[PDB]
Structures are given as C-alpha cells and as structure tokens.
C-alpha cells in the first residue's frame, strides 16, 4: 500500500462529492490491479468514518484516525478471503450484513469495504444485493473490481460505478523509472503487459516475476526453432501460472501482429525472440496457439482447484501436435 | 510482588465472595477472563470480578495488619476452598513466588495467580441519573416481566428489557413479538425522561443483587453503562442500543369485552388444559359465554381436553385461540386474587391484568383464525 500521484484528482473529486452529502452510498471502483484501488478506498473510508474538521485531509489526532492506523475500528468492515481460501464466502457477507443492522458503536458513520468484488461467489453477491439497494442511513459501501461485467448484473446495477484512468504511458514511464532502475525498453514492456497500470509493472520488478519472465523467454528461444514445445512445462507450472500464460499470450500476439507489420509491439524488450516466432510459425498456427493459450488461461482462473500440471501439460502437447504439418487447426466457436 | 498478609474472617467473606462470583461461570472465552481480583487498600478489601461487560465489587473491612496490594485468583477454586471451613475460622492469604498461600488453622493451600495488571476494567461514564428505590419494589417490578423478554433471537435487541423513566414514575417493558409485558409504578423523585435497554444477563444479575428490605438500592443509569449500589455491593454492566416498539400501540385501546375470574382457578384450569395440548403448538381455543369460559385443547394424537370455568362475563362468543405457555407464565406471575381478561375481536390480541391493580399489564396475540 502506497500513495500514487495520479490518484490525487480522482480522490479530490470523489471526496468533494462525499462531503456535500451527495455521493452515492455504493461505489464500485474499476481500478486495475496494482493501481490506486486500495489506497483510494482506505483514504475515503478514513475520511468518512471519523470527524472531518480539517476538511478533506486526515485528522490524525481524533480517535477515529487512531483506530484506523491501529486497524481495530468496530465500524470499518473489511470483506476479504481468508488465508486458507481464495474466494469470498457467503458466510462472511451474511455475518457482516447482520452486524450492519447494529448501530454504530462510536456514533459516527459506518463503512463496509470488499477487497475485490469479483472474488465474490454468487451467493455472496446475492446476499449483498438487499443491503446495497437499501442500506442503513449511516452506511457506505466500497467495491473493487478489474471488470464490472464479470460481476453479477443485478449487483453491478445497484452500485454506482467509477473509473480510474490509466496514466499516459510517458507519465507512467517517468514515474516508474524514478524508483525502478531497469532499461527503458524493459520498463515499457513491463508497463504494457500490465495494461499501462503502474504498481503492477513495478510489481514485476519488485518481486521475482521478472526473472521468471526472462527464463520463459530463454525457454521459448530454445524451443521454437526446434518445435520441441515441451520442457516449457517447468517454466509454466507455478502459483503464478495465469500471469506467465498471459506473458506467453502477449508474445504470440506480438508475433501475429508483427506478421501484419503493425507499428507498435507489446513485447519490445525482446525483438529477436518475437522475430523468431514470426519466422518459424505460420500465421494460422500462431493464431490457433494464441487462442488455445488464452482459453486454457481462462480455464485455470475460472474453475477452482483444477490441477494445473495436467492442463499446462495437455496444452503443450496440443501445441506440439499443432506444429506438426498436416494437422487441422481448431475454429473459435460460440 | 509484595507479601499480602491479608487476614479475613469467614463470616465477612463468604457472602460477598458468592456475590462477586455470581456473574462469572462456565467455560470462559479466554483464560484470566475467569478470575477475581482482591485488592486491599488502607484496611479495606475489595473483591472484583468481571465478564468484560459486567463487573462486581464487594468491600469489606479489615482490622489485622496487612499491606495495600492487588492480586488475582481463580474464582471457583477460591470460592470452594473458603467454604466448608470451620465456623469463625480466619483465612490468612499471602503472596510468595507468583503463588497464593491460603491458611486456616493447620490447613495450607497453594494457588496459581496472575499479575493484577492482567485484570481488565470496564468503561467510565459520569453524570449518571440517580435512583433510590426499595429492593423488593424493583424485585417485583422486574419479576412481572422477567419471563417476557425473548432469549436468543435476532430481531431488535429482545435479549433484554426496556426501562422508561417519565415524570415521577418508572415503567418496565419486555416482549417477544407475540407476548408483551408492562409494569409501571411511581418512584417518588423528580425524574427526567429516559428509555434504555438492559440486557438479559444484566437482568438476571440485577435479580441476584437484591437482598433484604434494608437500605435502599441506588441505580445509576446512563447510555452505555448501568450501576447498582446495595450497601457495600457495587454492580456495573454494559447496556444495549436500539429501542423496543411502542408498547402504547401494542396495548389494545378498545377493551370492550371484559372478563373477571379467579387467579388460582384459572391458573389450575390452564395447567390442566396444557397437558393434552400440542407439544410444539401449545394452543387452546376459548369459548366465552355469560359467566362461563370454556377451554379446548387438541394434539396430533387427538386426546381432546375440555374444561369449563365460572367467570364474570356478559357478551357474545369470541372463540379466541392462543398459546398456553404464555398465559400460564403470566398467571404464575400475577399471584393476585382476581384476573381481568380483556378481549376486542376474534382476530385482535388479548389483554391480561390484575383486577385490583393497574400497576402491571400484559398482552398476548392470538394463535389461529
């Protein structure tokens, strides 16, 4: 958690709406992961819950700010998946809803914030529906998603939406280079892979993701000219398998797009690699491999508890089958 | 820490120790929570216990040498060891090496202790509204409605009961959504208007507090804390927010149909009728004719039960069907000589009152149409 400069306008606007008593109780943030998703929600919640003598800033002396910094306030509910789970169960939602009918202990307003509204199971969202539509007078909600459409349609209606604009790419590169010391092309590539959203591109360098990406690039450089797509299984099977699959998908998209001679490339840090991908693979084969990789990535994320070893191994075996001449490629279908 | 050297007479210890050990009990949520703190300052020993939403303080006087200090002991073990001792025997308690040695005659016992700083305290509130009332007064005030409050329900905060102070009168109400009980009575002091909800556990402890027709109890009411003083006994508890429905609207305003009966006769008739009623739906139906009340009860095994009682009634037949446990409880509580039933309609609720007193009233909703 850290503050971002580009969050300052949105924050101000939204808080300016809240101070007048006109802001909607149910706010749905569209911020991309790594963007000012949690920082904005925390800032707004801290402003709302405690007193506001200083205006839109933080009055750290008041007991409300003290409880926020201690993280022990009773009227600041957080909906998060537990350590041992991934989705957000309906039991926590039901319990928080029952707790909401209780009047505020401190006599101030109430705030209920969900860490990520996409993680809700259908029952959880349905349970929230009634409280979102008709909440107690002291209550304000805050939702966080990457994709509003992935949410339940009825819940996506009751909650007023709000969008965070990704910063211009030059501004993003300027901000990233300040505290991250990498090459300009590598920095641009990391920014583009994260859909222009900082933090996530910063997260690629801060964590161990970048070394994994480089290992993946080396493995592709070894595999593509030989048609031996196996031995990629080691570079792909991981707790971040969707992210590395997305990296592979970006590489394939870059190859296919450069085949048409497009101006800009998603993967600029490794022009030789994408050039090799263009050389050794037919455009139809590249398109089929890209489609299959994206589909299996969606399979990995959607269904829960699926053994990834089997899925990535099957994907690689099917890719090796595709590279063989005289093989019918699949057709995208409804 | 220091060496206690507290010498306490058993007669001046057993009863206050039982008083302070009342609220605690069962398996606590966490350790230390089940414990009690004894603290001696300038010849006065205070026994304090808590549930972190309740507190008990008992003050006793000491004449023997000592030192000012506070120590914690497990409650049940100390209560059981102090009792059963020979009558008039002094108890000498002394702290060595993080343990408590208790001595009586040639009897020695060692108990594990905790630092006094590990015993939490409750909140503080000032400018509490003060009350001076007789013990048995508030005793029967709550007793008329102690059964009324619903236990373990989500609706409102029915796990408790409402005190309302208006003018010079204190009124107390409880309900469940099907039965409601009110009891209003003039105290004798200039009082403001207040409405508070005391929790069910606090109600039980308040009943446990009352003892003797001696020095009057002193209430200190607030918004989130309640206090009671009975002699050298001090009790504190935490209140409940929210508010009950308007009892005034609950009471029927058209008691057109009247019935006068004997308390004991009606109670015995209802007790007999309840035997053959449905085990879960303990409902009987009532036919009201001139100076006659007939009660009919059924159950899945049939076994129809009928009874007839002489009353003072004039009007038409109503055929009011309602639960038996409720009416049996209220008739148990009345202990009066005569009972007034008040009926409005075959769909309307019914009102139960003392014939010779208006201090307490009750209402019960019907069962089936």
């Amino acid at each position: 958690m850290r503050w971002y400069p580009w969050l300052r306008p949105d924050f101000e606007k939204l808080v300016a709406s809240y101070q007048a008593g006109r802001g909607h109780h149910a706010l749905l943030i569209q911020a991309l992961p790594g963007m000012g998703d949690d920082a904005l929600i925390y800032a707004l919640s801290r402003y709302l819950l405690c007193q506001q003598p200083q205006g839109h800033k933080s009055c750290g002396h008041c007991r409300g700010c003290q409880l926020m910094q201690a993280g022990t306030h009773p009227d600041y509910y957080t909906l998060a998946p537990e350590k041992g789970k991934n989705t957000l169960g309906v039991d926590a939602v039901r319990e928080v809803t029952e707790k909401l009918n209780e009047h505020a202990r401190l006599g101030g307003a109430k705030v209920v914030w969900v860490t990520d509204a996409a993680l809700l199971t259908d029952a959880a969202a349905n349970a929230l529906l009634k409280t979102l539509e008709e909440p107690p007078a002291e209550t304000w909600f805050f939702l966080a998603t990457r994709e509003p459409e992935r949410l339940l349609a009825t819940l996506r209606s009751r909650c007023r939406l709000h969008y965070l604009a990704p910063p211009p790419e030059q501004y993003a590169v300027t901000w990233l280079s300040r505290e991250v010391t990498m090459s300009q092309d590598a920095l641009l590539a990391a920014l583009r892979l994260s859909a222009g959203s900082p933090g996530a591109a910063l997260a690629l360098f801060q964590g161990d993701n970048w070394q994994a990406r480089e290992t993946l690039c080396q493995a592709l450089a070894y595999s593509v000219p030989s048609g031996d797509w196996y031995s990629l299984l080691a570079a792909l099977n991981h707790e971040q398998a969707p992210a590395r699959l997305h990296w592979l998908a970006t590489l394939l998209m870059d190859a296919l797009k450069r085949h048409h001679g497009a101006a800009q490339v998603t993967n600029v840090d490794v022009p030789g690699l994408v050039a090799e991908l263009a050389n050794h693979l037919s455009p139809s084969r590249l398109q089929a491999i890209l489609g299959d990789v994206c589909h299996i990535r969606e399979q990995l994320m959607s269904v829960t508890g699926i053994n990834r070893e089997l899925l990535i191994t099957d994907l690689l075996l099917r890719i090796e089958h595709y590279l063989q001449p005289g093989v019918v490629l699949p057709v995208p279908h409804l | 820490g220091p060496h206690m050297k507290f010498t306490v007479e058993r007669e001046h210890l057993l009863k206050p120790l039982q008083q302070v050990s009342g609220p605690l009990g069962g398996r606590p949520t966490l350790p230390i929570l089940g414990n009690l703190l004894l603290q001696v300052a300038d010849g006065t020993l205070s026994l304090t216990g808590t549930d972190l939403e309740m507190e008990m303080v008992a003050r006793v006087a000491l004449v023997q040498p000592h030192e000012p200090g506070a120590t914690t002991v497990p409650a049940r073990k100390f209560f059981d060891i102090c009792r059963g001792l020979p009558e008039g025997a002094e108890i000498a308690v002394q702290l060595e090496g993080e343990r408590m040695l208790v001595r009586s005659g040639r009897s020695r016992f060692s108990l594990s202790t905790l630092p006094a700083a590990d015993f939490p305290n409750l909140d503080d509130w000032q400018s509490e509204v003060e009350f001076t009332l007789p013990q048995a007064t508030m005793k029967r005030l709550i007793e008329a409605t102690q059964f009324s409050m619903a236990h373990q329900d989500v609706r409102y905060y029915l796990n408790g009961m409402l005190f309302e102070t208006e003018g010079e009168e204190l009124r107390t109400v409880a309900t469940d959504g099907h039965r409601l009980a009110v009891c209003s009575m003039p105290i004798g002091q200039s009082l403001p208007s207040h409405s508070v909800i005391v929790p069910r556990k606090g109600v039980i402890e308040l009943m446990r507090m009352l003892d003797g027709g001696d020095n009057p109890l002193r209430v200190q009411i607030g918004s989130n804390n309640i206090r009671a003083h009975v002699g050298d006994f001090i009790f504190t508890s935490k209140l409940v927010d929210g508010r009950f429905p308007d009892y005034r609207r609950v009471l029927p305003k058209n008691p057109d149909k009247h019935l006068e009966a004997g308390c004991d006769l009606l109670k015995q008739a209802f007790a007999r009728a309840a035997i053959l009623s449905n085990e879960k739906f303990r409902g009987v139906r009532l036919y009201v004719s001139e100076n006659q009340l007939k009660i009919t009860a059924n159950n899945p095994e049939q076994e129809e039960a009928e009874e007839i009682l002489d009353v003072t009634y004039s009007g038409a037949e109503m055929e009011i069907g309602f639960n038996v446990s409720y009416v049996l409880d209220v008739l148990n509580a009345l202990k009066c000589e005569n009972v007034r039933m008040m009926l409005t309609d075959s769909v309307s609720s019914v009102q139960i009152e003392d014939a010779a007193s208006q201090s307490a009233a009750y209402v019960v909703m019907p069962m089936r149409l």
Partner: protein, 360 residues
C-alpha cells in the same frame, strides 16, 4: 437517502410507475374485483421494478379503505409500509435467509393473526436463492395458505425456481423498458428535481441503461457527481466512453481491407485517446448491421448515416453479404469473450485478428 436516486424516487402509486401497462392493468382489475390471489410472482430483469411493484401491491392490499386498486396515499398503515414501520408485512431477502431453518420458522409463524390490516403479506425478495429444502417447505403453504396471508415473490429469473413453485403462483413478467419510456421518466425526474439536463445526454443515458431503469438512475447520479453537478452532453459522453467520431467506420474499413498496420494503429490511437472497448465493438456491430440492411435496400441507409453515406454505400457495394455476416459473427464472439480476457484492449485485438483472417 440524501440525494441517492432510485431510492428516494421509489414509486408510491400505480399511476406513478413507468410502463408495465399489462401488469398494472391485471393487478388493478384483480384488486377492484374479488379476483385476489395468494401467490403473485413478479419476474423480470434487473431494475425493471420487481420490489417496487411488490410494495405497491402490499400498500393497496392493507389500506384502511379496504381492498383498493390505487393505494390511498396519506394514511398510517401505508406510511408505515413506506417507512418500514410495518407489522402486517414481512420483507425477507431470501438471498440472506437461505437456511431452511429460517424458512421453517417463517412457516411456523404463518398461522398467527396480523396485528393490524386484513392480510399478513410475506414479501420474499430474491426468491431463486432459497435452498431447495426451503423451497419444498414453502411449497405446501403456497398451495393452500390460510385466508389471511398472501405471498409475494420477486426474482431476477424464474429458471432457478423449482417448477412446482411456478405452478403455484400467478406469473407477471415485467418487460424491459424501451428507450422512450426511460427517457421520459428520467426527464420527468430531472424536471421535478430542478437539475440542468440536455436532451442528447438524456438519450445517451437511456441508450446505455440497456432497458433497466435503476441503471438509468444510477448513471444519471454518476453524471451528476461528475461534471459540474448537472447533466450535460459533454460530461455524459466523456464518462460513458461513447464514441461520436468516425473511428468506428475507419476501423471497419481497415478491417475489411485487412490493412494490418493501419487497423492496429487505429486501435493504438483509440487506446491513446482511451475509447472504451465494449462501446467500440458495439458500434462496429451497428455499422456492420447497417451494411447488411443496406444490402437489401439503399433506403436502409440509416437516415442519412450522418454525412458519411458514401463510405458505407461504397462498402455496401464492395463486400458480399456472406463476408459481412462472417465479420458480424466474429465481432459478436469477441464481444462475448471480451470480459474473459487479461485486459479489454488485448481482447479487442484478438477479435480483430480473428476477423481479419477471412481473406479480407
């Protein structure tokens, strides 16, 4: 409820609801005559009004005047329903009381006579989330309830409902609201709230609501909170991510000509200007639809198609309808799969690559 729309603007009389002529007529005729029922089931998509019509029926049933078609208005046993100080009514959000134990508790408290009013009305909202055992528990009571109780059921969809529960209830299907009805209601609200509004921005809001009125109200509130506290065409256009230029048609032409570098530079420039991708795809489908319509008759040039007639005319002359249908199908599949993509931009890229490969 300070200034939140669609909460302080809940309908309170049958004359105030928007559309729903068939449902309102049926309910009014039932109330006026003796034709009353013990299980009404209002089903329809989001924000068409299920709960509101339910509450209006409840107010009409329990009014002091009696069984009346139009609710009275000023009275105690209607204002209590409006404020939620109700005792003859029972609102249960079934999505929270899914447990069969709570449903059996409800069935246990069905015989008790109401404190006031002639009917104890159980409004079970979000019915389809009840667990199966709870549904079977409600089945018998719905079949033959006591004469003094009536059930009202509202669900986003009846498919999840067990078919027996359907066979127990009177089904009223709230049809989605057309563009004109939504626009009229929003203009009426804004006139009654003295808020500056512009007809074009109102049309964009009505179009983006997708036939659900609560969405229209929420989008109006988003516009009000944005901009300068008033509904204006520029602010609504900016916030909705709508496109009002010929970028869509240029993209269609480039994709038809399969000009890869140009057709990708167009998407890159669109991302630079930040055009929302779902709207861009929707307009692409609209333009292809206008192509197909023109191929039957040039009068199906959409009005005068702004001022770019020639282009689509030219396009309508150069591409066989088979390739147009192929492009439409590919674009629609891409729109379906667009949410299930790492990010919308690259999903639109996938859709464009799929569309370009048909020898365009």
């Amino acid at each position: 409820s300070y200034q939140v729309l669609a909460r302080k603007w809940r309908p309170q009389t049958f004359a105030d609801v928007v559309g729903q002529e068939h449902v309102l007529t049926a309910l009014a005729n039932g109330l006026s005559l003796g034709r009353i029922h013990h299980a009404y089931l209002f089903s329809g998509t989001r924000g068409v009004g299920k709960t509101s019509i339910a509450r209006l029926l409840a107010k009409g049933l329990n009014c002091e005047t009696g069984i009346t078609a139009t609710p009275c208005g000023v009275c105690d046993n209607c204002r209590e329903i409006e404020q939620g100080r109700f005792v003859d009514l029972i609102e249960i959000d079934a999505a929270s009381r899914t447990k069969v134990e709570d449903t059996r508790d409800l069935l246990d408290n069905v015989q008790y006579a109401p404190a006031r009013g002639r009917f104890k009305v159980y409004l079970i909202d979000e019915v389809h989330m009840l667990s199966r055992h709870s549904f079977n528990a409600l089945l018998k009571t719905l079949e033959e309830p006591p004469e003094h109780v009536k059930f009202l059921l509202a669900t986003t969809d009846p498919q999840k409902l067990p078919v027996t529960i359907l066979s127990r209830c009177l089904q009223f299907h709230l049809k989605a609201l057309d563009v004109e009805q939504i626009r009229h209601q929003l203009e009426h609200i804004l006139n009654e709230e003295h808020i500056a509004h512009e007809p074009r921005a109102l049309q964009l809001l009505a179009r983006a609501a997708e036939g659900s009125l609560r969405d229209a109200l929420s989008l109006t509130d988003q516009a009000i909170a944005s901009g300068d506290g008033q509904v204006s065409t520029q602010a609504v256009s900016a916030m909705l991510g709508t496109l009002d230029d010929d970028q869509a048609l240029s993209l269609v032409e480039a994709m038809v000509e399969a000009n890869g570098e140009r057709v990708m530079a167009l998407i890159n420039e669109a991302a630079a200007r930040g055009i929302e991708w779902e709207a861009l795809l929707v307009e692409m489908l609209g333009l292809l639809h206008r192509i197909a319509m023109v191929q039957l008759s040039p009068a199906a040039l959409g009005n005068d198609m702004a001022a770019i007639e020639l282009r689509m005319r030219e396009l309508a002359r150069t591409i066989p309808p088979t390739d147009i249908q192929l492009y439409y199908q590919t674009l629609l599949i891409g729109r379906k799969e667009l949410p299930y993509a790492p990010d919308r931009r690259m999903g639109v890229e996938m859709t464009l690559l799929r569309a370009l490969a048909f020898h365009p």
